Design a binder for this molecule. Structure first.
Ligand SMILES: *[C@@H]1O[C@H](CO)[C@@H](O[C@@H]2O[C@H](CO)[C@@H](O[C@@H]3O[C@H](CO)[C@@H](O)[C@H](O)[C@H]3NC(C)=O)[C@H](O)[C@H]2NC(C)=O)[C@H](O)[C@H]1NC(C)=O
Ligand SMILES: *[C@@H]1O[C@H](CO)[C@@H](O)[C@H](O)[C@H]1NC(C)=O
Length: 241
């Protein structure tokens, strides 16, 4: 019978970033609709309730930057958005804008970034993978089950991936079941609100730590309750009969 206790650990790490960039603060904008061949679907589940969950689908961004270098492109730009898809509506989860990026280097080497805009509930237990293209969730509560949509924009061109998240082991004893005032994900918006430009990022989401520190803060909380961070997160499975 495995104990359910806090454990000693070092404070959250302060990693050195990959590179120096200018952070663009206090920007807003309408988040594009997530709706409308069809979308590549993947599946993510956890064998144990206090496991880490990954949402991983290599989007082949390496090739599309290689394509741009072959056309002598001087730069590229990018936007990464996550949503929770429900009946009729979508919750915005994550927004991140990369501008003036170098295509000869690996994705993300950009002269300008916004901070990542996060849903407040989600940011307490989840952070982007190291390549900033997937998500890691640290022992999510069962209420996290659902359909998560990733939208990758390169040079204005979007590509979508869905993740069907299934959590049959239930809550973990230390899962975060709410943020302040018990709030869970933020408001679900229907397609029309997105189209009419009402889902302003600075209004519904909050600017947050870059991936290195974000991973460090959550990993610390996760580890202090006994969790082990895996050394690798494999690609999420597709549909299998
Ligand atoms: C990331 O870069 C994208 C392009 O690299 C930007 O999207 C492009 O913005 C252009 C404006 O500079 C659009 O302009 C088109 O060109 C003529 C002018 O010659 C206009 O009159 C047209 O009306 C206009 N056409 C269209 C189809 O809008 C580009 O078309 C547009 N291209 C794409 C593929 O979106 C993004 O704005 C930029 N993203 C960010 C966040 O800065
Ligand atoms: C730029 O930042 C990198 C890491 O972020 C650091 O190693 C380097 O010393 C910095 N250089 C300057 C000139 O700021």
């Amino acid at each position: 019978p495995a104990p359910r206790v806090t454990v000693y650990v070092d404070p959250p790490a302060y990693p050195m970033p990959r590179y120096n960039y200018t952070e663009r603060w206090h920007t807003t904008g309408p988040i594009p609709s997530p709706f409308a061949q069809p979308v590549e679907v993947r599946y993510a589940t956890s064998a144990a309730a206090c496991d880490m969950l990954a949402l991983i689908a290599d989007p082949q961004v390496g090739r599309t930057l290689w394509e741009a270098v072959r056309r002598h492109a001087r730069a590229y730009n990018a936007t990464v958005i996550w949503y929770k898809i429900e009946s009729g509506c979508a919750r915005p989860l994550y927004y991140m804008e990369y501008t003036e990026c170098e295509p000869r280097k690996h994705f993300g080497y950009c002269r300008y970034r916004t901070p990542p805009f996060w849903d407040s509930f989600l940011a307490g237990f989840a952070y982007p993978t190291d390549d900033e293209l997937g998500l890691i969730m640290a022992a999510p509560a069962r209420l996290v089950e659902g359909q998560y949509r990733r939208a990758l924009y390169i040079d204005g061109t979007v590509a979508y991936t869905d993740f069907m998240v299934s959590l049959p082991a239930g809550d973990c004893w230390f899962s975060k079941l709410g943020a302040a005032r018990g709030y869970t994900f933020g408001a679900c918006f229907p397609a029309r609100d997105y189209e009419q430009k009402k889902v302003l990022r600075l209004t519904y989401l909050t600017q947050y730590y870059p991936q290195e520190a974000h991973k460090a803060i959550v990993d610390y909380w996760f580890m202090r309750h006994g969790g082990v961070v895996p050394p690798y997160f494999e690609e999420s499975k597709g549909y299998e009969p």
